[PDB]
Design an enzyme around this catalytic site. Structure first.
Site, PDB file in Angstrom:
ATOM      1  N   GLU A  23     -20.544   3.747 -14.415  1.00 43.27           N
ATOM      2  CA  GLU A  23     -20.003   4.978 -13.820  1.00 43.27           C
ATOM      3  C   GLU A  23     -20.059   6.028 -14.915  1.00 43.27           C
ATOM      4  O   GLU A  23     -20.275   5.637 -16.071  1.00 43.27           O
ATOM      5  CB  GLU A  23     -18.565   4.728 -13.391  1.00 43.27           C
ATOM      6  CG  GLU A  23     -17.661   4.538 -14.591  1.00 43.27           C
ATOM      7  CD  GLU A  23     -16.269   4.086 -14.232  1.00 43.27           C
ATOM      8  OE1 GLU A  23     -15.558   4.820 -13.511  1.00 43.27           O
ATOM      9  OE2 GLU A  23     -15.912   3.022 -14.685  1.00 43.27           O
ATOM     10  N   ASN A 350     -13.435   0.038  -4.949  1.00 42.29           N
ATOM     11  CA  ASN A 350     -13.292  -0.275  -6.390  1.00 42.29           C
ATOM     12  C   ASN A 350     -11.879  -0.806  -6.559  1.00 42.29           C
ATOM     13  O   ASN A 350     -10.942  -0.061  -6.170  1.00 42.29           O
ATOM     14  CB  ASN A 350     -13.519   0.978  -7.229  1.00 42.29           C
ATOM     15  CG  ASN A 350     -13.266   0.773  -8.702  1.00 42.29           C
ATOM     16  OD1 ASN A 350     -13.970  -0.038  -9.322  1.00 42.29           O
ATOM     17  ND2 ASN A 350     -12.258   1.452  -9.235  1.00 42.29           N
ATOM     18  N   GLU A 351     -11.702  -2.003  -7.100  1.00 43.44           N
ATOM     19  CA  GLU A 351     -10.358  -2.500  -7.550  1.00 43.44           C
ATOM     20  C   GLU A 351      -9.280  -2.220  -6.497  1.00 43.44           C
ATOM     21  O   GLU A 351      -8.204  -1.620  -6.850  1.00 43.44           O
ATOM     22  CB  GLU A 351      -9.962  -1.806  -8.858  1.00 43.44           C
ATOM     23  CG  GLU A 351     -10.944  -2.142 -10.004  1.00 43.44           C
ATOM     24  CD  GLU A 351     -10.287  -2.354 -11.362  1.00 43.44           C
ATOM     25  OE1 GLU A 351      -9.435  -1.541 -11.720  1.00 43.44           O
ATOM     26  OE2 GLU A 351     -10.592  -3.367 -12.038  1.00 43.44           O
TER      27      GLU A 351
HETATM   28  O1  LIG Z   1      -8.194   0.307 -15.183  1.00 37.52           O
HETATM   29  S1  LIG Z   1      -9.481  -0.080 -15.758  1.00 37.52           S
HETATM   30  O2  LIG Z   1      -9.433  -1.510 -16.182  1.00 37.52           O
HETATM   31  O3  LIG Z   1     -10.071   0.911 -16.654  1.00 37.52           O
HETATM   32  O4  LIG Z   1     -10.614  -0.017 -14.792  1.00 37.52           O
HETATM   33  C1  LIG Z   1     -11.929  -0.397 -15.185  1.00 37.52           C
HETATM   34  C2  LIG Z   1     -12.311  -1.055 -13.881  1.00 37.52           C
HETATM   35  C3  LIG Z   1     -13.016  -0.039 -13.032  1.00 37.52           C
HETATM   36  O5  LIG Z   1     -13.886  -0.639 -12.059  1.00 37.52           O
HETATM   37  C4  LIG Z   1     -13.675   0.832 -14.100  1.00 37.52           C
HETATM   38  O6  LIG Z   1     -13.656   2.217 -13.746  1.00 37.52           O
HETATM   39  C5  LIG Z   1     -12.837   0.825 -15.365  1.00 37.52           C
HETATM   40  C6  LIG Z   1     -13.590   0.938 -16.697  1.00 37.52           C
HETATM   41  O7  LIG Z   1     -14.562  -0.100 -16.860  1.00 37.52           O
END
Ligand SMILES: O=S(=O)(O)O[C@H]1C[C@H](O)[C@@H](O)[C@@H]1CO
Ligand SMILES: *[C@@H]1O[C@H](CO)[C@@H](O[C@@H]2O[C@H](CO)[C@@H](O[C@@H]3O[C@H](CO)[C@@H](O)[C@H](O)[C@@H]3O)[C@H](O)[C@H]2NC(C)=O)[C@H](O)[C@H]1NC(C)=O
Ligand SMILES: *[C@@H]1O[C@H](CO)[C@@H](O[C@@H]2O[C@H](CO)[C@@H](O)[C@H](O)[C@H]2NC(C)=O)[C@H](O)[C@H]1NC(C)=O
Ligand SMILES: *[C@@H]1O[C@H](CO)[C@@H](O[C@@H]2O[C@H](CO)[C@@H](O)[C@H](O)[C@H]2NC(C)=O)[C@H](O)[C@H]1NC(C)=O
Ligand SMILES: *[C@@H]1O[C@H](CO)[C@@H](O[C@@H]2O[C@H](CO)[C@@H](O)[C@H](O)[C@H]2NC(C)=O)[C@H](O)[C@H]1NC(C)=O
Ligand SMILES: [Cl-]
Length: 627
Positions: A23, A350-351
């Site tokens: 990203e 996402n998540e």
């Molecule tokens: O809260 S985080 O652990 O930073 O989230 C992570 C998971 C998410 O998919 C990505 O944007 C980020 C950085 O790699």
């Protein structure tokens, strides 16, 4: 330890096992993989007449600058213009600079493409040269070019000039400039919009990618690219989410958006540039679609999802649709790519474990609609596996873990105890990020890694032998984050770092490369590593060549002997290659020492028995031919 290698494969290694997660984070997009050199190039998503609107831009001499909501903007998508005024009684060079993304590499072996839009908002008798160029911030002009402009030009006009430095700059502390003569210019106002400065790009794609970064990504032999996020997909609000259609077409027509890492995204790195990159590198996309949640905590209600579901369909249609059957597919054809691209995997959100209360109904409505449109696409759920219970049954989950290097080697058996029930797993975001189990997301002082270390890469490597062993069900795995501008970091550690001038390949980068480039299509079962131990391995074989890749991760402080027994094979090569990444536990590739830790290749003696001493904190690949 004696490691017996079975000649009978247990499963086919997925083509997608190793790849990239991207990203726009740490200026990975704007300032990174996207070749654009001017920061805030089009005043996207800034408030007019504020200091922040002028971010990265500076007057030369007595220039008056303001970012204005232009009464006649260059486009609907770019409502802001740089108002440049030269005071009465001016002389000498007057104009403005862009500082780039913490600098601009000025290389005499490169030709740069400068462009901008200008108009005189009030017709004048002005007649003179508009000069653009590159100068050192110390005040030396390195490149310049000029063209004649007239104050009667009251309609938006693009200026396109190449730049040829007379000398490479000794550092990246250089700026782009635009000047006019202060006496000829005295009393004039010119509105500018949509600036651009491109170096030569990867594959000479004209809206393309920064060569050294793109080549570094390609170097790692990734099979897939998960995009466009990540948090950066979600937005802080519905209104600020990533939207595919805002990232395609002419740069004049891309409004940009406030991203999720504290900065404006130009969306110059847009859906077509992503897909073009995949075509250029042989990568296949794992494409995320927005799923009705943003990082402010707002879930769309079930009765609000339909237009967002359609937008996700639109996005997928841009990639793979027949151009005769949808506007987005026709748009892809109109932008010079009538052939559909490859798309096998779509991630829903996402998540969404952060919105586990609403994901069941978001997943249900999105996937019901999307699976009916796209029966061959595999849709990936983003909540914790099997909690909450999703309908329809997810064919795949995206599993995330940030942990200590130790956790990675201690959890190499993560997937061994999973049921084989047709569900596949994407380890879509992982890294050893801290040596402090109590404060993973803390400061560097409290154990956070500023860069990957030999310790972190070796722990990750041990975990990866587990992903490969379990690649009957683990189809895809990506370190995250991928990219880091060292002058604008929201997250460490990162796989690949850079400034305006050069790239730093992490220890974890080399582990990723060693795993991805030395990977056969057959998984060869072997003696199992100790579950909880520091020493792990994974063996695969290319069925076409017999090239057999023995990958060994020693994630601990002690050297460990392995004796390989290949007696089941009819033949083993009498020699093999060894590739080893090792060094001191806490050693890192840094801006100051970017080649501290690099793999070494040698030739070792092999056959049906051979012994290798895996050093402490090492990633080793032993390649032999077996038949
Ligand atoms: O809260 S985080 O652990 O930073 O989230 C992570 C998971 C998410 O998919 C990505 O944007 C980020 C950085 O790699
Ligand atoms: C990219 O495509 C999406 C659609 O997939 C576009 O978003 C849509 O934009 C229209 C026009 O702004 C929205 O309609 C408006 O809704 C409001 C609010 O109720 C209403 O008051 C207006 O009269 C109008 O109907 C539509 O809701 C919105 N849909 C979604 C899903 O967001 C978007 O504009 C496109 N982006 C660009 C830059 O082209
Ligand atoms: C100033 O920029 C112009 C425009 O890019 C350069 O002229 C171009 O040169 C290239 C390569 O020779 C040609 O393909 C284009 O057709 C040219 N266009 C025009 C309109 O001339 C020019 O070379 C640059 N001058 C300097 C000193 O850098
Ligand atoms: C595949 O197997 C997993 C275990 O690896 C199953 O997970 C269980 O699913 C139910 C709900 O469907 C949960 O309440 C349990 O807690 C889950 N168990 C674990 C250990 O996570 C899963 O359902 C199976 N999937 C299919 C398609 O059969
Ligand atoms: C961007 O980051 C680089 C790398 O951290 C900076 O260059 C370093 O600056 C430190 C501290 O000022 C020096 O002692 C190091 O030797 C530099 N490293 C290298 C490899 O040059 C650079 O100053 C930063 N740029 C900006 C504008 O902040
Ligand atoms: Cl640790």
């Amino acid at each position: 330890v004696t490691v017996t290698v079975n000649k009978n494969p247990s499963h086919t290694v997925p083509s997608t096992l190793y790849g990239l997660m991207f990203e726009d984070i740490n200026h990975s997009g704007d300032g990174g993989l996207y070749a654009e050199l001017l920061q805030n190039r089009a005043f996207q998503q800034v408030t007019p007449n504020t200091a922040a609107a002028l971010a990265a831009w500076h007057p030369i001499s007595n220039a008056k600058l303001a970012v204005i909501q232009d009464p006649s903007p260059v486009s609907n998508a770019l409502p802001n213009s740089l108002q440049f005024s030269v005071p009465s009684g001016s002389s000498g060079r007057v104009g403005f600079t862009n500082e780039g993304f913490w600098g601009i590499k000025v290389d005499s072996t490169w030709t740069y493409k400068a462009s901008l839009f200008f108009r005189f908002p009030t017709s004048s008798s002005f007649s003179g040269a508009l000069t653009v160029g590159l100068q050192t911030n110390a005040g030396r002009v390195l490149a310049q070019n000029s063209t004649q402009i007239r104050g009667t030009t009251t309609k938006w006009t693009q200026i396109n000039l190449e730049l040829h430095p007379t000398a490479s700059a000794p550092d990246v502390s250089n700026s782009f400039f635009v000047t006019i003569d202060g006496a000829a210019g005295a009393g004039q106002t010119i509105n500018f919009a949509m600036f651009s400065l491109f170096p030569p790009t990867f594959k000479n794609r004209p809206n393309g990618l920064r060569a050294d970064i793109a080549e570094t990504l390609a170097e790692m032999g990734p099979s897939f690219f998960r995009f466009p996020g990540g948090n950066n997909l979600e937005g802080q609000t519905t209104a600020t989410r990533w939207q595919w259609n805002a990232t395609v077409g002419s740069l004049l027509d891309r409004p940009g958006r406030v991203g999720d890492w504290g900065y404006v995204n130009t969306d110059g790195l847009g859906l077509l540039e992503y897909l073009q990159f995949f075509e250029d590198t042989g990568m296949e996309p794992i494409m995320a679609v927005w799923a009705g949640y943003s990082l402010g905590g707002t879930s769309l209600a079930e009765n609000q999802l339909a237009p967002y579901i359609q937008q996700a369909i639109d996005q997928i249609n841009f990639v793979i649709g027949d151009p005769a059957k949808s506007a987005p597919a026709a748009l892809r054809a109109s932008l010079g790519h009538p052939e559909p691209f490859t798309l096998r995997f779509v991630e829903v959100g996402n998540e969404d474990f952060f919105a586990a209360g609403s994901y069941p109904y978001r997943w249900h409505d999105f996937v019901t609609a999307l699976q009916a449109q796209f029966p061959q696409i595999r849709f990936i759920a983003t909540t914790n596996a099997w909690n909450p219970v999703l309908s329809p049954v997810p064919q795949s989950y995206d599993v995330h873990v940030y942990q200590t290097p130790t956790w990675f080697y201690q959890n190499a058996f993560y997937y061994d105890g999973f049921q084989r029930n047709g569900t596949t797993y994407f380890e879509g975001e992982y890294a050893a990020i801290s040596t402090n189990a109590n404060d993973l997301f803390g400061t560097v002082a409290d154990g956070r890694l500023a860069f990957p270390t030999v310790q972190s890469a070796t722990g990750e490597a041990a975990f990866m032998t587990g992903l490969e062993r379990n690649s009957d069900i683990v189809f895809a795995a990506s370190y995250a984050p991928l990219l880091q501008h060292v002058n604008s970091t929201q997250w460490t550690p990162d796989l690949v770092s850079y400034d305006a001038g050069s790239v730093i390949k992490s220890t974890s980068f080399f582990a990723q490369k060693l795993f991805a480039l030395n990977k056969g299509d057959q998984y060869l079962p072997s003696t199992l590593p100790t579950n909880g131990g520091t020493l792990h391995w994974s063996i695969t074989r290319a069925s076409s060549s017999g090239k057999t890749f023995i990958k060994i991760a020693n994630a601990g402080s002690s050297a460990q002997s392995l004796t390989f027994q290949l007696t089941q094979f009819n033949s083993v090569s009498s020699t093999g290659t060894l590739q080893v990444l090792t060094g001191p536990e806490t050693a890192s590739n840094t801006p100051e020492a970017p080649q501290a830790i690099v793999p070494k290749t040698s030739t070792i003696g092999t056959g049906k028995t051979f012994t290798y001493n895996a050093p402490a904190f090492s990633v080793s690949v032993i390649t032999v031919t077996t038949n």
